[model samples]
Target: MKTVEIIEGIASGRTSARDVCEEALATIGATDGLINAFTCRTVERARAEADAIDVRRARGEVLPPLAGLPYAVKNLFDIEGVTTLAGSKINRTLPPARADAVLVQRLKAAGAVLLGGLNMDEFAYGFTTENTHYGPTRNPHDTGRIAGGSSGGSGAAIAAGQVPLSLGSDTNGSIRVPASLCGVWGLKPTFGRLSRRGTYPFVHSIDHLGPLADSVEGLALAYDAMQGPDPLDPGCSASRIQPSVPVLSQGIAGLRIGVLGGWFRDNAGPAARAAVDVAALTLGASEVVMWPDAEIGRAAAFVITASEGGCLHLDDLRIRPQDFEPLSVDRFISGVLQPVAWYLRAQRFRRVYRDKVNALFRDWDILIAPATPISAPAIGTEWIEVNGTRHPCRPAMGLLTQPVSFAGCPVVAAPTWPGENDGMPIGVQLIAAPWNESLCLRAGKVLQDTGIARLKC
Candidate 1:
């Protein structure tokens, strides 16, 4: 069901919050055996919250915006009295969080009940959700294949119909990648568009919070509630930006959609290319724009992510180094040993890349590309041999997504037509001008409405 329909059902007394909560819990119970999407299940607390909402409605009290809607958060987001594991074994002994993360608090205020904390890669480092700590989050469409990470659980939960809404953090396509693999809709809003306070940070500079959902309206509803100013987050802007929910249905009639060519199209597999082509045709895009310096942009993103992520874990590395996952430990070690000069040069190059992309946006309202170069591979596979050339499976999957995210533009990955290979879903990413998430959602809705891509769940 769409977000508006779900809310209307609760508001009009046609359905109670307890009914929705029970349905959501049952859905999770039914599917989680195969998907393993959640790391923790807050069934008792969620039921209590739902009952309270129903009681308020029974007394004729005004309901909150998202009354009765069920949602899940990434494991990194702290809930009061729950220890935020962040999908790691190291934090097992940590004390429970005294309060919910800023974003979680906002969702609660809007009456969205928290189902649980979902799974992710250990420390949110890896692109694939194949965490050594928590077993890989499998794709809902195909059990053997991976659900892309580090927000794999968030994506899988929504795709499998456990919940229609969930939140995830995106630093380098964390939200979009899994959304694509799981065949769900996701929005990675502009950097600092939503507060990160009380959520564990993977990369301080690039980390962002956004939503993954089954429908466009869900994306807008979650975005509208979690946005606005947060005094606790220093990175959050104090500026009062107008909500974009009202503009989602306006369509992409006059919007100039730029199809990203060159690097985005060059090495993509047939399925990926076909998906982007279908999206372009559905959206009526005429021009295929070339991103001349995409390699530099990707490199800059890698450098920044590595440097920041490495630093965040430096203390743990010095003491209790054995507590971390092997893959995460090695990745962080490599980052710590990276030359400082390379990081500095990449930061400078980031400015140049951002300026160039921003200049292109002056002429275009949206940019389109494949969310991934290939679909999900078998879980635990090491190297992906493409055209007789082997590349690290995890990092290679983010080729098309990394550069766009590096530019800090708002992007949404919507499932395109399903592909022939195992009938796995593929997604085409729609990137909007900075902070122009409305355009991305509108364009996604247009494509979705055209029947090009429909969510089966």
Candidate 2:
């Protein structure tokens, strides 16, 4: 259901919060195993929350904006009564969190019911959620394909209709990758725009937390409700609330849009390449702009991510290597081995890169580019055939997204059903300058309303 319709349903007395929550729980019980999207279910807590909403309705008390809505978060989010696994076996041994993460608290306060924790790549690493600890999070469209990670479960749950919205962190392209592959709407706001308190750290400098939903309205609804400064989070901005839901209808009129050429164009499958054109035509975007050094920035992003993640777990690697997900062990070691000089180089590059990308925005209000090189790659498949050259799916899938995110630009992963794909979906990145998420969502609104972009699942 659309966000508005769901709100109307519960508010207009057509459905009880308990009924909706029970139906959602029933569906999860019947179908979650097909995708394995959740790390665990919070049936009791969800029930309690739903019952409270029902009580409020019965008393005729005022309700919050998102009253009776059900949702979940990537396992990294700290739920008060559950282990904050962050998709790793090691964290499971730790004590439960004393309180919810800032984002979770905000969502709960808005009257959304927390269903459970979703699956993800270990320590927010990798492009696929093929966790050695937990099994892979398969795509909803076809169980055989991979749901892009490390927010794979976050994306899959929405695509499977298990939830209307979810929260996920995008260090490199965790949210966008899965959103594209799973065919959902993902919004990665500007870096530090949202609080990161109580969430597991990957690359502390680059990791971004945002919402993933099946519709632009849902995305905006959650984004607006979650807005505000949090003194608890050092990274959270102190800027005043900028709500997108209110301005969502202010379409792409008078906005200058451009297509990214060069690095963003290369390595994309034909369908993905054509998908950009579809979005461009729909938004009246015909100019192609050259973006310099996108490849260099992506490489730097990987180094910084690896270094920070390795350092964060260096003590754990030494004390309990056995508890770690073995698949990411070698990769973690590589990060630990990175030279101090390499870390500095990558860090310095991030500043310059953000500047370069932001400069492009001075001339264009929005930029259109492919979200991934292709649609969902087959699950457990290592290499993908792209232009007669075999490319590893893990790194290759981020060819387009890594650079955009590296610059700290806000992006909306707008899903598009590509031709010649096997019941799968691809996406285009709608990027805007820093703090201009409204502009990005505005363009996404045009694509969604015009039928040029849509979710297949």
Candidate 3:
């Protein structure tokens, strides 16, 4: 059953939250070790929250939209009583958090049961959730393949049916790639639309926090409930909050939709190409336009990410170099060495690209692209072939998505079954202008309901 079903039944007194929570815990116990989707477990915290929801239902109290629903988040989010590991062995020395992240609080306020913190790439830096400290989060569909990261655990859990909903961050396709490879519904809400107060950051300007769900409606429901401004998060915008749930059924019968070409269309695998074409056909998108300097935009994303990320961790690198993962060490040092002039130039390019991308939205209400060049690669594999060239798997996988992130646009990575894949799923990227998360989500709703977009769960 969908997460909405769990919420509706519990609200109507047809079910108890405790029973649902227990089932989630049981599922994790039976399956998570193999997938290694979580960094830690919160059985007691989840049980307590579940018991509270059951009590509220019994009292005939008005329950939140997610009453009794079980969910988890990438370990970056601060969970009260737990140290926010952000998927690294180095950060374990910090004191435990005293309160939950603002978003986690919002989920709790909506009565969703908090299962625990899922795993991710260390410091949210990598494309694969092959954590050096925590084991790699394997694709739930095929244990031998990878679950894309740094949101691998978030997507894996949902794909494995361990939970109905989970949260993940998107800093250059962290959420989208994992969602696609794991074959679940994932949202990378407009940058700054959601607060980042308690979650750790990587490439702060491009970082986004959003949910992954078995269904589009469930994902939108969580998005709506979590909407609001947080003063603490300066990146958290003060723009008028737009609720997507009400407009979800307001389908794209006449909206102008465009499919991205050039960088987005070229160099993609069969699975990735099929996913985009299938979605475009379903949405009546006849228009195809190329994004300006898309490759350059992707490069700019890399520079800004490296400079900012290196700057953020420079002090740590000096004091505890041995504590860092070997995979991350050389990358951090390289990032630190990138000159000031290049970083400054990248910022200027960001403005130019954002304006150009935004202008396209005036002529088009929505845009479609492939989220990843291919589905999940084998665990610990080094490279993938695209077109005639073999590309390094880590950086090359999210080529299409990195440029979109550069523009700070809202995106929905909707998983689609490849007509002839080895049962691995691919994702279609539905994009909208900044702060217009609703339109992208509504478009996702259309694809999902029409069965053009499908998740394993």
Candidate 4:
């Protein structure tokens, strides 16, 4: 069930929180063996949380905003008494967290039930969730194909209908890429707009946390509940809550919208381009607006991510180099060997890149682009052909998304079925300037209402 239906059903006594919780747990048990999306299951905790909600309802007390809703988080988020596995066997020896992550704490207060931890790429270093420690998260539409990652399990769970909502972290397109391949709705809020306390970090400069849901309404509701200024986290930039739910249904009339061209269009395959066309036709956006220095933006983001992520694990690398995910250990070593000059140059260029991105927003309120260059590739596939050019499959999956998120803009990834990709799904990104998530959600609502973009599951 979608989140809104779950909410109304519980309130009207059609379904109780405990019943819904058991249904989700049952589905996960029956289906997770095939999908491999879950790393751990908190069955007992889920029932306890759901029972508490039912007790409040029985007592006639006012319920919380997300009362009785079931959700899960990427394993990077700290769950009290559970070891936070960032998809690595190396973290197995670490002790359980004493408390939940800040977002998980907020969700608990809002009455959302925690279902346990989902899987991801090791240390969130790759675009595909083919973790050697945990089996790959297979796409629900095609079991042989991949569910994009490092948030692959987060997307696969939603696609498999085990949960209505899930939380994920995006650092160079993890959340957006997975949502695109899994055919679900996802949001990557503006960088620093949401607090990141207690979540495992991948890239300190670029990491962002947000939601993936079966519906845009659920996404907005989750986003609103997760908001607030977290003074403890230096990366959090918001001083006051700017709720997206109130402005979500305001419609996009009189708003300037255009499709992103240049690098965004050139890198995409035919199916990816067609997905954007569907969104453009529905939103009445035709003009091809050029994004400034998109290639450079992606390059800078890549450098910063590698530098921070690599350096953060140097002690682990030195102590237990053999324990890390083999697929990413080499990449981490390369990052450690990179020149300081290159890292400095990338940081300096980011200031200029941010200014140029902001200037383009003056002429447009929303911009559209494909979320991925293509749909899900086969699990072991190493190379893919796009527009007569061959590229490495894993990293290429994030080609269209890196530049947009690197700018710290808000984006809604709405799943679009192009009807030409062998029943696979591609997503179109609805983007708005920093701190304008309401505009992105508004555009997504139009696509959902017009049936141009809808969840396959």
Candidate 3, poorest ten consecutive residues by summed lDDT:
234-243
Best model number under lDDT: 4
Query: lDDT per residue, candidate 4, 173-254, as tens digits?
Result: 9999999999999999999999999999989999999999999999999999999999999899999998889888888899
Which 10-residue window in model 4 sums to the lowest lDDT? 448-457
Q: Which stretches of candidate 2 lie over 4 Å from their true place?
A: none
Question: lDDT scores for all predictions?
Answer: 0.86, 0.88, 0.88, 0.94
lDDT of 2: 0.88
lDDT of 2 by residue, 1-457 (tens): 6567777799888988888898879888888988999988999999999899889988998888889888999999999978999999888789999999998998888889999999998999888898888899989899998999989999999888888899999988999999999999999999889889999889888889999987998888888888889887888774779989889989887889999988877767788888999899999999999876988988998898888898889999898888888778778889999999999998888778878887878898998899888888778787898767788878788888888788888999999887787758898899999999999999999899998877763
> Residue 271 error for model 4, in Å?
1.0
Off by over 4 Å in 1: 386-389
Cα lDDT of model 3 by residue, 1-457, tens digit: 5787888888878878999999999999999889999888899999999999988877889998888889999999999989999988888989999999999999999999999999998998888888888889999899999899889999999999999999999988898999889999899988888899987887777888999999898889999889998887889874666888888889987789998888887868878888888899999987788888999998999999988887889999889888877777778778999999999999998888888988888888899999889888898889788877799888787888898887889999898988778878998899998888889988998898888888764
Please give the distance, in angstroms, between residue 28's alpha carbon in candidate 1 and its true position after superposition.
1.6
The residue pairs in collision within model 3 are none
Q: What is the TM-score of each candidate against the true structure?
A: 0.97, 0.98, 0.98, 0.99
lDDT of 1 by residue, 247-320 (tens): 88798877788789888887577888888888888888868898759877888889888888888889888898
Candidate 4, residue 17: Cα displacement in angstroms equals: 0.4
Worst window of 10 by summed lDDT in candidate 2: 1-10
